[PDB]
């Protein structure tokens, strides 16, 4: 019944920065609110209750604030465990709707994506399927659009994506852009080139394979 919208849905900062979040409500929830630090793969850990009362045991740098409808959270120092998904929850009246979930990550080592291409192997032809993938590596930030000019026409929908989490060495990601087809359609068209979009690079690098044995 009550929709909580938290902003920004994606933000990145380095070690020891000053980070702020907001969780705006559509109805007045008084001072009833709770904040969580839900690392993926594990249960969330409570941080704030009643929108300003720090929980016991948790680090006391989570100087929460906000009252009424505009609720905000502030962090002074950043630990390695700070970078995780945050959720804002209300408990004013039923139902107990949660928040969308903001993200905090390290923002360092800006670089350009490395585009790869791998035409399907011969033993993938033994089965009635085609497995061709255009790999993306060493890029920042996460968002990127991969285009596939199939003879100049984009048969969109078959471009699957799978991004690994933030890196602990050079702070990058890795998307697996693949288009799984069959033998009756893969051999029909001529060119299968994957083109991506990014800001750190100069020109979108086109990667493809020669029509035939490659």
């Amino acid at each position: 019944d009550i929709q909580l919208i938290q902003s920004p849905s994606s933000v990145s900062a380095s070690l020891g920065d000053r980070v702020t979040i907001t969780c705006r409500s559509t109805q007045g929830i008084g001072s009833d609110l709770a904040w969580y630090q839900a690392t993926p793969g594990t249960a969330p850990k409570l941080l704030i209750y009643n929108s300003f009362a720090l929980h016991k045991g948790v680090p006391s740098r989570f100087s929460g604030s906000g009252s009424g409808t505009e609720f905000s959270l502030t962090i002074t120092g950043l630990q390695p465990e700070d970078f995780a998904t945050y959720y804002c929850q209300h408990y004013r009246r039923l139902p107990l709707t949660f928040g969308g979930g903001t993200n905090i990550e390290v923002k360092r080592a800006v670089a350009a994506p490395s585009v790869f291409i791998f035409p399907p192997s011969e033993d993938q032809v033994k089965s009635g399927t085609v497995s061709v993938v255009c790999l993306l590596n060493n890029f920042y930030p996460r968002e990127a659009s991969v285009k596939w000019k199939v003879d100049g026409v984009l048969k969109t929908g078959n471009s699957q994506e799978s991004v690994t989490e933030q890196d602990s060495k050079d702070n990058t990601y890795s998307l697996s852009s693949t288009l799984t087809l069959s033998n009756t359609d893969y051999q029909s068209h001529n060119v299968y080139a994957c083109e991506v979009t990014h800001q750190g690079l100069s020109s979108p690098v086109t990667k493809s394979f020669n029509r035939g044995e490659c």
């Binding site: 019944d1 109805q27 007045g28 009246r93």
Partner: protein
């Protein structure tokens, strides 16, 4: 309601001015509550939180 309503002035219609609100009151006995309905003009009722109340 009647349809033509003697539309000589043709000013409007009282819908979107009244609300048909139900609430729980107490009868002549304190230990008994009854649910009753009433028509209230929109100028007599204020909308608190939980907009459907």
């Amino acid at each position: 309601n009647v349809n033509y309503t003697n539309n000589f002035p043709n000013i409007g219609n009282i819908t979107d001015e009244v609300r048909n609100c139900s609430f729980n009151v107490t009868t002549e006995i304190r230990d008994k509550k009854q649910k009753v309905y009433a028509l209230f003009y929109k100028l007599d009722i204020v909308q608190m939180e939980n907009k459907n109340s």
